[PDB]
């Protein structure tokens, strides 16, 4: 007689029937063969095996079977893991998975209040949960949880969630279940709401999260619950040519990278050659000590050395370079003409003495060109350098092809579209290059010593430091007007609540968020949305459909922000904005109304333009298509606006990934490296008409299929059609 | 046939005018004017400029400087001085001739007009016109002694002319050496009571112009100007904390741009520290800093190998390590982070480094067993010791800090402790990190307000005594109190760039007095370096310097008030240089000085002293080249060498063989001599060791370092070869 070791030490006679039951529950409703997995378990059986070992084998074997031809094995693997998690957490919190009548209850509604209370008192959960909810509130919300929504998770979804999202105790054990996580996130985001409305909003937030219609960013997904509510995704720093500010921004970069991430740094003001790259080296070393973008204008004298940072004694391998390019450079490139490099220091002096200093970088477009033409002659030989446009352009694309960097920032279109151009301008984007928000450096005052006490007090006037508060819409489940009309206003509300509940580590961050209340709404499952609507990627139908879809998203994004303004008040800096003059996405309402008719949406854009002029909007910025990374893997969605990499592939920590309904739509899905990205860019240009910020546009090129002069044509077309950024260039 | 003059023009060559220039320059000096006259005949060419002729006489005279004919240096110096006088006279629009037609290099009448004009151009500071009347300037202008320019060697005046004499916007020298000294004295006299000011300006001018003392390089080139940067060095203490680490990185960058002499202690930082070392290095390059680490720190192996590139490593060594090295025993490396937690939870955290000596050993023995395997690392003492001396022999670094003797001798041990020294390793002053508070945003305005509680950040305010001219009790009794007063005035007139610097200087009022011409002082007193007579003479001399240093600080306390943190110090309990007055009184009798040490101990207990620290033998560098002195307490490198800057010891011809060069000396004597001096020095000494690869081996080099520790030295500096 063969034996098996159980959780409670002990020893029990092998029962083949109990393994059959576990497999049957896990395969229920799913297009798989339970007999196949039963056979594999017979082969994997060994006398004295632990019940824990048996469960780990069924999970792994099921995950090994995931394919483009049988994708449902992922759901079988996920459930087998879920059934193991339920048992672990039940034993840790001291309840049973059986009720009075002996039915299976993975979730314990009675335990919810006791559980959260205990781990609030251990410093794992934040105090604001007990302060803003009564025992009856907890009990009411515990009974609202829908345990059947755990059946929405792919194996990689729950595996990623289990590995670094589900909260753990001091000894590193998982304590909360997926639906408990979602409810606690909803409860955290509902705190800023009026006490008589709080439970009503917590239920709506829980619904839209648990049903996988929207997701909040990774920071919010793992911190909204905890004492330290770090909910911010990225920061954008502006550095003045000044020992004090340079070392101040180096400090912020170090503080940011320890606690948060997504750092972007503009060094275009810094003096030309110590120079600028010692400052780049200085930021690099703080990065290593504890994922940051550094931006430089393409006319900066040190640009040649800056492009070579990631590829002779002056390199930096922990930073991501980016290049701010004006229209004039692109105009020069057409006729293969020459390009004059300049030093900001001598450029600043000249302009400042020709009129609170003003450099060249403090102008864009029509004005910038006037100053540049005058500066490229009337400056002395020591503050200039002559180079060929095509020679520079060619070397950039060569580095881009080998390293993937640098990222591009088309500063002229970015600035003339900035709807808050009345409060300043924008010198760079963030790391992922979706953000376009007004920015400026902090100003310092001389410190003061009190000899009696020994305390020193220094003061600084806060500058505009864009924080990004991010979420995304699952286009798999939200693509109709009815679905968009419900969901977008709810996501706008959640992200405005994120700003109120965020723990601010940098004071300038708090100052900027309170004045602007900027948010970034993106999308996932874009490619799946096209395929199930029978739309080919490389077609006129793609461009026409993208136009129609992103019009709806923009309309109900503004509608949502308007309602918050009526209810909470407009953002402080609304008066003077493009919004306040009835200019939406840098276009007249007559232009939009004509676009609305061609799209077959026929939305009331004029009536909305009038209500925004009267009541304002709650948020200074709204839409930015960010790279969606871990949040789409949890949703089982295709990433952002990217075309899929493959119909099936893996990763390592095994994370097998298939697009939604890949078996049903096999050939309707076309992989990234097989697509002519002239279409990708035309499609992005159509979307850009309804996006106030930018898009993290990747380009996927095959060395065999693409050459030097064709790669140039893509980048040139991006500029021509009015894109503000380009992100990674993969191969 | 013809020569071009300053005023364009053309004049018939006159061989007599070159003879006169050479005669004035050789007057009273042991040289051959005919030799230099012959060389000038060879160097003559038709259409040569008078300027070119003068540059040739200067260079030729400098080329003749040797150990057998040193007076050529004075001939070269004077020929340069006569050129400087002409240049400055033409720039300020006066003549070198008076009413009767006598030679007047200095224009007493022009002094007020000159300084007034260049104050109004932003070259000289406003405090000069604010604290002195036209009659004051005129009185001090008439006190100047132009004959004191005859005290300069060629390298002395050449260094002074190149780096120190103030220049206008077009880069031309405007002030003469004696004008520089008077303007320095006038700047240091500003803090004095208006009815006493001129009296102190004349005394400061006298002691500077007569080359009896010098102030540090910063004071020598800035005391005169609007930006009075008079500080020589700073010592930073860094807490294991993002905010403080980046705060100290900012200070290091601010300090190195404007000042220098930086020292940084990183012994508190968490074990894998070198990313922080790399971070300090990059700020240094962006715009000469020491970094110190305890020898028990887990990252010490990687830290020793940093220089095998813009930083100078140093190692804090406790007694226990040296005790282990005797029996060739093992040495347990530790991480401060886990060491701090253990000690802190066993009772504002308290780490291992926050203890010394008797207490430190108790904690270390307990930490070396009861800690887990991940927070430890076992290594052999002799294996580590040997690798340190190997790097020291190849690179010259690391410098050494014997922290136990340093801390038990700290006379201000009641306000904290000392983790490291400065760059040059003469400084031993109480130090601590600044403590940070959470910033505050006013949403209505844009303004953020940050608070931090200032920590003890030692600034060093430095000068030195010329032992060539000040070695008797009568000379020391006059000069030392005057130098103490000048350095206390330096603290009042210093422009503070870092607020913690201002806070520390005002609380402690620490000063550092060193020496130059030590080797010359021994030789002219007929004392052999490698002898018992050296040890006996050093004892006697440094007793006198210490006694009249304390006397000087006492007088200032009676007059200006004791330093804020006096009460609780070793000074206030009558413990001088970590010894009882009965011990000192016995030492005073053996030295044949018989000084009233008990009476002084009592007066210090009653009235206090003005300065928290007094004595530190710093490397004397540029200031001794100006004085023509042998550097600090070092034995001379050579009887003659170049840097063209030809350098000879004083009276090298007269004392040729009595002078013994550095690489020929058994430095067992150097260390014994330093140990005797250390009994009368409250801080430390920048002790260099000069070893010949052929004459010394591995085990003998170890014996020197071991003996330094045994005899109670607090630091060792460069190891040259
Ligand atoms: N006697 C058995 N023979 C075969 N498989 C078994 C046996 N007992 C448990 N298993 C299997 O072990 C896996 C893990 O189940 P489970 O986590 O409930 O372990 P357990 O040891 O039965 O724990 P507990 O007694 O706490 O419920 C399941 O797939 C189950 O079918
Ligand atoms: N109704 C159900 N639906 C899905 N999974 C279930 C259900 N009932 C139990 N499970 C899961 O099946 C596994 C076995 O649980 P169960 O308590 O039945 O243990 P067993 O090993 O089958 O029996 P026993 O513990 O009595 O020896 C666990 O992972 C559990 O979460
Ligand atoms: N006619 C001359 N023949 C030879 N040497 C001369 C003659 N005139 C000047 N010198 C030499 O030139 C050197 C520099 O002299 P000085 O600085 O006085 O220059 P200068 O041209 O005479 O200027 P000034 O006339 O303004 O005094 C001296 O060594 C001096 O002997
Ligand atoms: N009494 C003196 N003692 C020392 N140096 C002197 C003396 N008189 C002049 N000199 C210096 O010697 C040089 C002589 O310059 P000065 O103009 O006096 O005469 P010169 O150049 O020989 O001839 P001339 O007067 O025709 O120009 C100058 O460098 C001057 O500073
Ligand atoms: Mg069981
Ligand atoms: Mg002349």
Residue numbers in the entry:
A (entry chain A): 2 to 274, 286 to 302, 311 to 331, 336 to 379, 409 to 706, 710 to 787
B (entry chain B): 3 to 274, 288 to 302, 311 to 331, 341 to 379, 409 to 704, 710 to 787
List sentences from the manuscript:
The structure of AaR1 in complex with ATP was determined to 2.70 Å resolution. The tertiary structure of AaR1 is a homodimer, where each monomer contains an “ATP cone” that houses two ATP molecules. The AaR1 ATP cone has electron density consistent with the presence of two ATP molecules, which is highly unusual, as R1 enzymes generally bind only a single ATP ligand in their ATP cones. The second ATP molecule (ATP2) binds the AaR1 ATP cone in a manner very different from that of ATP1. The adenine base is positioned by a π-stacking interaction between Phe26 and Tyr105, a CH/π interaction with Tyr84, and an interaction between the N7 position and the side chain of Arg99. In the ATP cone, there is also a single magnesium ion, which exhibits octahedral coordination with the phosphate groups of both ATP1 and ATP2. The individual AaR1 monomers interact, forming a dimer interface consisting of four α-helices and their associated loop regions, as well as a novel structural feature in which a β-hairpin (residues 495–515) from one monomer interacts with the equivalent β-hairpin structure from the opposing monomer, forming a four-stranded antiparallel β-sheet across the dimer interface. Interestingly, closer structural analysis of the AaR1 β-hairpin revealed a unique π-stacking interaction between the Tyr511 of each monomer, a residue that is not present in other NrdAh sequences. In the AaR1 structure that lacks nucleotides in both the s-site and the c-site, loop 1 (residues 275–289) and loop 2 (residues 303–310) are disordered in both monomers. The two cysteines (Cys235 and Cys521, AaR1 numbering) that are known to become oxidized upon product formation in E. coli R1 form a disulfide bond in the AaR1 structure.
